[PDB]
Amino acid sequence: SGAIYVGNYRVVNRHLATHNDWANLVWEDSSRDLLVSSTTAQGCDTIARCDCQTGVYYCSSRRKHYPVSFSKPSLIFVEASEYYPARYQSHLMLAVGHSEPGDCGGILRCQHGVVGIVSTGGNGLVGFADVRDLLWLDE
Numbered sequence: 777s778g779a780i781y782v783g784n785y786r787v788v789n790r791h792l793a794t795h796n797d798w799a800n801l802v803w804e805d806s807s808r809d810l811l812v813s814s815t816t817a818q819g820c821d822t823i824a825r826c827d828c829q830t831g832v833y834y835c836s837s838r839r840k841h842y843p844v845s846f847s848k849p850s851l852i853f854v855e856a857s858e859y860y861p862a863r864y865q866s867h868l869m870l871a872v873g874h875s876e877p878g879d880c881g882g883i884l885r886c887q888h889g890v891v892g893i894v895s896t897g898g899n900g901l902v903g904f905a906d907v908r909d910l911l912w913l914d915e
């Protein structure tokens with residue numbers, strides 16, 4: 777679990793979104809595992825607007841933050857789950873690090889702010905859904 781709260785928006789993994797999130801839908805993309813819904817309160821998260829490839833992420837299965845080197849957003853093959861069939865997830869950035877299924881939602885951050893959230897993992901790897909290209913979140 778986990779979300780980004782920026783301005784009048786809540787950004788979550790599409791596979792974990794609630795009824796409320798779908799009732800207050802702004803935008804959704806199955807191919808990125810992202811969903812954005814509207815909130816009546818103000819979000820104070822700063823979204824990074826950069827090309828960084830190092831940062832820190834929250835790993836709830838270890839209750840620890842880990843520094844990571846991560847790849848550029850790309851189309852990466854993701855195995856079948858009860859949420860999606862086998863497919864290419866776009867805007868995904870991998871790193872060597874610990875992750876477990878309940879880890880999705882954990883924020884990845886650099887010096888510039890929120891980079892994205894945990895979306896994939898396994899085999900000693902962790903994948904983050906990038907949000908730096910969604911410029912409309914701040915305006």
Ligand SMILES: Cc1ccccc1NC(=O)N1CCC[C@H](C(N)=O)C1
Pocket residue numbers: 791809854857859860865875876877878879880895896897898899
């Ligand atoms: C997060 C994780 C870590 C270690 C082991 C397994 C996982 N589970 C996953 O990768 N996913 C399950 C839920 C949906 C995900 C997606 N973006 O399609 C894929």
Ligand SMILES: [Zn+2]
Pocket residue numbers: 824825826827828886887888889
């Ligand atoms: Zn940055």
